């Protein structure tokens, strides 16, 4: 448990080891996931379009509305464009959400950078 950092995301990066901010961009985002449903299923899943590495599944309920976030790391930002397209995948009987976690956060962020 811990989290936390500083930086920023350039436009280009050298051959250096993965940033603290770099890390956020080859994330995704996805939702609506069934009541059973395990990592696993997620990572195979998700397997189609590239390699995962972790995935952080939210169980802890925050808002009243009954839904469920997860969170996947793709070996690249490039092999996320493929997941977010998955969406509508009938997953375990219940379809799966994706979308670009950063799309959710540029927005927050003021129209320039951050």
Known sequence: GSSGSSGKSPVREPVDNLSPEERDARTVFCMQLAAR????????FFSAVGKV????IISDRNSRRSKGIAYVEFCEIQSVP???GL???RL???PIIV????????????PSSG
Do not use: Y
């Open 87 to 89: 969406t509508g995948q």
């Open 92 to 94: 375990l009987g219940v």
């Open 82 to 84: 493929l997941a977010i």
């Open 53 to 56: 590495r972790d995935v952080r």
């Open 37 to 44: 449903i395990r990592p696993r299923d997620l990572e195979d």
């Open 99 to 110: 979308q670009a976690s950063q799309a959710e956060k540029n927005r927050l962020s003021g």
